[PDB]
């Protein structure tokens, strides 16, 4: 029988025998908690066109916030961005008129809205406003529950970026570009 | 009107952890899978330092007749960096595997390979009949029995 005995000694000299080196796969375009060589941060890693110097690993901006990193395994540069962040506002006409409303998610593309809320809420109502046929991508964010119309009326409820929402028509909430008065010559 | 009611935040999907390349993986296989094994009286010593070890691949194979670690689980000891690790390799009779234990006394332990009462290392033993046995028998080993 072949026998091998492993004897470990910890002397005053620094430790040099290791082996816990967990290394997972690389994920891009997905909000994750990344740990790069002890640098821990939550964000969306994406392929970057930056050219770090051979000795440069991290990357920072004027605010001294890590905006880029270099994956040690392969000489690639990945930029970091916050996952989605944003506020949620409710565009609602006077309750005396109707109870239907619309939901505006600030500065986020409409694709991520269902996950940017987790969709695990009251089975109707909240899930109804997490998606639908009437989903409009505005410069102020994503609007769900309002029908975009090519017309232009006087601003009623200011959404932003020159876009306002109203209730006029089966009455329903619509979103449009505010008309800055009536043309005259 | 419009009222800012709440805030939303996309949570991390699962995780990601990335570390650099594997640098000179500790030569555990060089000793475990050594072509030549020294005798018990002259067990071969290999020093291990300045390397990154990986023994889970062989540990989970369940190919070892004994994988006994004293004072720590065989896998838990991995989550700790050591200053030096010595591998002592030899070949002994199966019935003699029990003799490689801390504080044990006998013809082999007291004369060939002695371990202290306080022991934290690991003892691994597996069958070697496929290499140390053949037609006509092998007589290439020696053992020390007499000493002052």
């Amino acid at each position: 029988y072949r026998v091998v005995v492993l004897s470990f000694e910890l002397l005053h000299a620094p430790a040099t025998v290791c082996g816990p080196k967990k290394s997972t796969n690389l994920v891009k375009n997905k909000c994750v908690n990344f740990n790069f060589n002890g640098l821990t941060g939550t964000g969306v890693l994406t392929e970057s066109n930056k050219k770090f110097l051979p000795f440069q690993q991290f990357g920072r901006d004027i605010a001294d916030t890590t905006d880029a990193v270099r994956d040690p395994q392969t000489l690639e540069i990945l930029d970091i961005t916050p996952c989605s962040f944003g506020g949620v506002s409710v565009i609602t006409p006077g309750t005396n008129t109707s109870n239907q409303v619309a939901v505006l998610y600030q500065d986020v593309n409409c694709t991520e809205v269902p996950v940017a809320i987790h969709a695990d809420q009251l089975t109707p109502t909240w899930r109804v406003y997490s998606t639908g046929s009437n989903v409009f991508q505005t410069r102020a964010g994503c609007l769900i529950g309002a029908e975009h119309v090519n017309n232009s009326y006087e601003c009623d409820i200011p959404i932003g970026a020159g876009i306002c929402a109203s209730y006029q028509t089966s009455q329903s909430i619509i979103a449009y570009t505010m008309s800055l008065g009536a043309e005259n010559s | 009107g419009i009222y800012q009611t709440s805030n939303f935040r996309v949570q991390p999907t699962e995780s990601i952890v990335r570390f650099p390349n594997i640098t000179n993986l500790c030569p555990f296989g060089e000793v475990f899978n050594a072509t030549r094994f020294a005798s018990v009286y002259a067990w071969n010593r290999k020093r291990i330092s300045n390397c990154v070890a990986d023994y889970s691949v062989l540990y989970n194979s369940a190919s070892f007749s004994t994988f006994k670690c004293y004072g720590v689980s065989p896998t838990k000891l991995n989550d700790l960096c050591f200053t030096n690790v010595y591998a002592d390799s030899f070949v002994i009779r199966g019935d003699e595997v029990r003799q490689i234990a801390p504080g044990q006394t006998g013809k082999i332990a007291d004369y060939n390979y002695k371990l202290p009462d306080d022991f934290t290392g690991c003892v691994i033993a597996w069958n070697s009949n496929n290499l140390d046995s053949k037609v006509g028998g092998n007589y290439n080993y020696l053992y020390r029995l007499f000493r002052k």
Partner: nanobody, 121 residues
């Protein structure tokens, strides 16, 4: 890496009592042995006490019967209590960490910073 921090000590009169604490970090406390050595000005370093990972204890003949050793694994702390202290005990005490291979007992283990203990006549 192995990190030890010593705390306590100070000045005490003859016949009093004192306590030294050693805090551990950067390793697994459950599989380690820890000891206290001491050194006085113009004197060689000598062992004061030692405790293995299984609660086994050992003292020096000069301090046996007066010093008590304990270790709290949950807090990863090692405590030494000195009773009936005498002026000869005045020294800097060092906390040493070693795998119980005689490594801690041989003084080849990791070292901290030390703590001063003074005993007046």
């Amino acid at each position: 890496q192995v990190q030890l921090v010593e705390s306590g000590g100070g000045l005490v009169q003859a016949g009093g009592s004192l306590r030294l604490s050693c805090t551990a970090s950067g390793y697994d406390f459950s599989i380690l042995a820890i000891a206290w050595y001491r050194q006085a000005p113009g004197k060689e370093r000598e062992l004061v006490a030692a405790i293995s990972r299984v609660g086994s204890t050992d003292y020096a003949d000069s301090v046996k019967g007066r010093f008590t050793i304990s270790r709290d694994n949950t807090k990863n702390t090692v405590s030494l209590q000195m009773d009936s202290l005498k002026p000869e005990d005045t020294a800097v005490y060092y906390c040493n960490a070693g795998i119980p291979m005689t490594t801690v007992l041989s003084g080849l283990g990791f070292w901290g910073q030390g703590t001063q203990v003074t005993v007046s006549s």
